[PDB]
Amino acid sequence: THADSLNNLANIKREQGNIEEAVRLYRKALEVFPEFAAAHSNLASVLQQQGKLQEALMHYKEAIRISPTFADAYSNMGNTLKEMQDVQGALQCYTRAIQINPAFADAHSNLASIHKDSGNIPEAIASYRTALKLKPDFPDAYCNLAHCLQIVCDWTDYDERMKKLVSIVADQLEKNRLPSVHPHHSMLYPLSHGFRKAIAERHGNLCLDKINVLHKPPYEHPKDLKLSDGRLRVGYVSSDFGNHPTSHLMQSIPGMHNPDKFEVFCYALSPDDGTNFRVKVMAEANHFIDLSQIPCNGKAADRIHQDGIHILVNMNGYTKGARNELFALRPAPIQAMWLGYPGTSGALFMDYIITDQETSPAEVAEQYSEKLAYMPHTFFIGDHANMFPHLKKKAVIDFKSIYDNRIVLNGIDLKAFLDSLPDVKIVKMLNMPVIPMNTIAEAVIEMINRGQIQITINGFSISNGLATTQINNKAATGEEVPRTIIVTTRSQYGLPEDAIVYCNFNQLYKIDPSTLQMWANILKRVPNSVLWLLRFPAVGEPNIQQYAQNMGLPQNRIIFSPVAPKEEHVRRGQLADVCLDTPLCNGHTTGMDVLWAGTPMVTMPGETLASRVAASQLTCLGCLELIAKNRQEYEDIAVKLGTDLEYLKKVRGKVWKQRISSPLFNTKQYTMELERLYLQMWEHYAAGNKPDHMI
Amino acid sequence: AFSPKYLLRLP
Numbered sequence: 122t123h124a125d126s127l128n129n130l131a132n133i134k135r136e137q138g139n140i141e142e143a144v145r146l147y148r149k150a151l152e153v154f155p156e157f158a159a160a161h162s163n164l165a166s167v168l169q170q171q172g173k174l175q176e177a178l179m180h181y182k183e184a185i186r187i188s189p190t191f192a193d194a195y196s197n198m199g200n201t202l203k204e205m206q207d208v209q210g211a212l213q214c215y216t217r218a219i220q221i222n223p224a225f226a227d228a229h230s231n232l233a234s235i236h237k238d239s240g241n242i243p244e245a246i247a248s249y250r251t252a253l254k255l256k257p258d259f260p261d262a263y264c265n266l267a268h269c270l271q272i273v274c275d276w277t278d279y280d281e282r283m284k285k286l287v288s289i290v291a292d293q294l295e296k297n298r299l300p301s302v303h304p305h306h307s308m309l310y311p312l313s314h315g316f317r318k319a320i321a322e323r324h325g326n327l328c329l330d331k332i333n334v335l336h337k338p339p340y341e342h343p344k345d346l347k348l349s350d351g352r353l354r355v356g357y358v359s360s361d362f363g364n365h366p367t368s369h370l371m372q373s374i375p376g377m378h379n380p381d382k383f384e385v386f387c388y389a390l391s392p393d394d395g396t397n398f399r400v401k402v403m404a405e406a407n408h409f410i411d412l413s414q415i416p417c418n419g420k421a422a423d424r425i426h427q428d429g430i431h432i433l434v435n436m437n438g439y440t441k442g443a444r445n446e447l448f449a450l451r452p453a454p455i456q457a458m459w460l461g462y463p464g465t466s467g468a469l470f471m472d473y474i475i476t477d478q479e480t481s482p483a484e485v486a487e488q489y490s491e492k493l494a495y496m497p498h499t500f501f502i503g504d505h506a507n508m509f510p511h512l513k514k515k516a517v518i519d520f521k522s523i524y525d526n527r528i529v530l531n532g533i534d535l536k537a538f539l540d541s542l543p544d545v546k547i548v549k550m551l552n553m554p555v556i557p558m559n560t561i562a563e564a565v566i567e568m569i570n571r572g573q574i575q576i577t578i579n580g581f582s583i584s585n586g587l588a589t590t591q592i593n594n595k596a597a598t599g600e601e602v603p604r605t606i607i608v609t610t611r612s613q614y615g616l617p618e619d620a621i622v623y624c625n626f627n628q629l630y631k632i633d634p635s636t637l638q639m640w641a642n643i644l645k646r647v648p649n650s651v652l653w654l655l656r657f658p659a660v661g662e663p664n665i666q667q668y669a670q671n672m673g674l675p676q677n678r679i680i681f682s683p684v685a686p687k688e689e690h691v692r693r694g695q696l697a698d699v700c701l702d703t704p705l706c707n708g709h710t711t712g713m714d715v716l717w718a719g720t721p722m723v724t725m726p727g728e729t730l731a732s733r734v735a736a737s738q739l740t741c742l743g744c745l746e747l748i749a750k751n752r753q754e755y756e757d758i759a760v761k762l763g764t765d766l767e768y769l770k771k772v773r774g775k776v777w778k779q780r781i782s783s784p785l786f787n788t789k790q791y792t793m794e795l796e797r798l799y800l801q802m803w804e805h806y807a808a809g810n811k812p813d814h815m816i
Numbered sequence: 817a818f819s820p821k822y823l824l825r826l827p
């Protein structure tokens with residue numbers, strides 16, 4: 122038939138990158154044969170680029186109707202349904218296809234993918250493994266399974282797995298195919314900086330293809346601030362305006378911009394989540410736009426053009442909810458990345474990338490497709506100073522006879538409560554109040570031991586640190602500063618009283634075998650020391666425990682605690698002594714949380730930006746001695762902190778002061794420096810100069 | 817229930 126010849130031509134032209142002039146080929150084939158089952162399928166498959174989301178569904182349904190045994194249509198339709206948010210149906214599409222064709226590997230891969238998205242990681246691993254058995258040469262399932270194993274810290278045959286992934290990327294990079302490793306995942310695998318940037322470029326090119334269908338003309342960009350009253354118009358685009366780590370770091374910056382010279386636009390790709398974070402940004406920002414009601418990217422980008430944004434800030438990168446297609450349209454002259462994606466976009470539409478020397482040294486350049494944007498001290502900023510000001514000062518209880526990490530008390534009204542106490546003693550490190558083991562301490566201890574929610578002492582509210590959720594739900598989330606006094610103790614989390622507490626509250630995926638070995642060596646060299654981790658996920662606990670047993674560490678040497686609300690999670694940091702940063706993916710936000718707690722953090726900067734973070738932090742903090750230059754230096758620094766107690770006290774004191782003295786948590790300072798950089802870039806663009814590294 | 821992992825001895 123003539124339809125078959127048209128079909129084959131269309132497929133070839135599709136591989137030829139001529140989908141624009143190949144979809145027409147598919148169309149002609151369908152016109153020749155209206156009921157061409159195969160032609161209906163593929164034409165929708167190319168439609169999966171974006172086109173009309175339901176347009177693909179129409180062709181897929183017709184293809185399945187014409188040939189009820191077309192398992193390719195079923196699995197593809199399920200994926201198309203996945204983009205449409207119809208999980209209930211996409212799952213049924215995959216299973217429908219699997220039941221028809223049990224040997225269909227792709228359906229098992231997609232079934233595992235949705236399980237993985239839903240969080241049933243073990244089931245995603247199982248289905249992925251079933252897909253690989255059916256089709257071992259299947260990069261997508263392997264990479265996803267490798268990611269799943271990384272998430273649960275399953276390092277069985279780890280090295281070869283890593284090597285296999287690099288080989289897959291090479292082959293897929295040779296053929297210009299879509300790499301199976303997500304650019305966010307690239308930071309977790311040992312790949313050359315070129316490979317990672319190439320993967321980001323390929324993902325960045327994906328949105329370009331889906332925007333060409335609009336054929337939207339170029340966007341006329343302003344060349345002066347005259348139309349804006351000399352005010353630079355900056356639009357912060359993010360889908361995380363709400364209870365998300367991005368908001369917990371920068372919710373204050375929008376309000377801190379100097380309105381005399383700046384006009385702040387907050388474009389939200391997410392609906393209002395009813396959190397005080399969204400409330401704050403919607404109120405303090407000069408303008409807030411819910412692009413979540415503007416699905417069409419062209420429509421949204423056009424709206425950005427109308428507002429007159431001079432600098433557009435991408436706070437998503439290749440994270441969930443990102444709508445980078447809007448940035449592809451170049452709605453603003455200057456476009457730059459900011460917090461949220463710890464990596465390069467590899468895309469032309471991103472002109473700049475905010476960083477700092479330590480985070481992105483000049484030598485580590487060429488790893489970024491974007492021109493570098495220098496931030497005087499650090500690119501990372503935190504709102505802990507505002508979210509948890511009750512942690513600025515703390516108090517302890519003398520259980521035996523100067524322990525600052527066993528029985529700690531926090532509270533805004535702490536000063537008045539202490540003044541009501543008869544025998545308060547002061548230990549100078551400004552200084553730390555200490556409660557002697559008296560009847561008041563006895564009442565507090567009974568509260569903790571009995572697990573009582575709260576007590577009253579001289580009319581003061583005393584809250585058990587583990588029951589903040591039911592005492593004030595808003596406070597536990599960090600939306601509200603607790604209006605009570607909170608008691609936190611090692612006994613709450615089973616930490617040994619007279620023991621060194623090494624901690625790392627990052628997600629377990631940031632842990633790799635070499636990092637675990639380093640920490641194991643630390644524990645062996647430091648007696649009476651324990652490692653404090655989080656069930657995050659909880660399935661990683663057995664894997665970590667087994668690898669410790671193989672490393673010679675008894676079970677009791679590692680203590681696992683469940684994840685806790687933001688306020689409780691940050692409050693627990695005081696209980697520990699030193700935090701061990703994950704060198705593979707330096708704890709970025711978790712590093713801020715621990716530092717606010719006053720807990721020293723030992724880090725080993727790497728080659729990637731994500732690895733180099735938390736070094737910039739420590740640098741800006743003024744605690745350079747906690748940055749290790751190699752594996753041995755990391756081990757030695759951690760071991761000294763655990764053994765030289767006087768050194769630990771001095772370092773913890775320095776962290777305690779620098780967290781407030783150093784311009785690390787000074788949001789107003791950060792905003793002003795950000796405003797400076799903003800201007801610098803504009804001048805460059807005003808004088809016609811194209812993006813060039815700002816340092 | 818919902819108490820500390822271990823108790824704290826006290827005279």
Ligand SMILES: CC(=O)N[C@H]1[C@@H](OP(=O)(O)OP(=O)(O)OC[C@H]2O[C@@H](n3ccc(=O)[nH]c3=O)[C@H](O)[C@@H]2O)O[C@H](CO)[C@@H](O)[C@@H]1O
Pocket residue numbers: 366367369370460461462463626627628655683684685686687690706707708709710711712714731
């Ligand atoms: C590797 C990675 O993904 N890095 C990103 C991450 O930093 P980071 O790695 O620190 O943060 P995560 O993606 O792991 O998110 C963890 C979040 O959960 C909180 N938490 C943690 C433990 C607990 O018991 N309870 C609790 O509430 C932490 O305070 C933090 O806000 O978020 C930042 C904020 O957008 C981004 O700029 C970083 O690029």
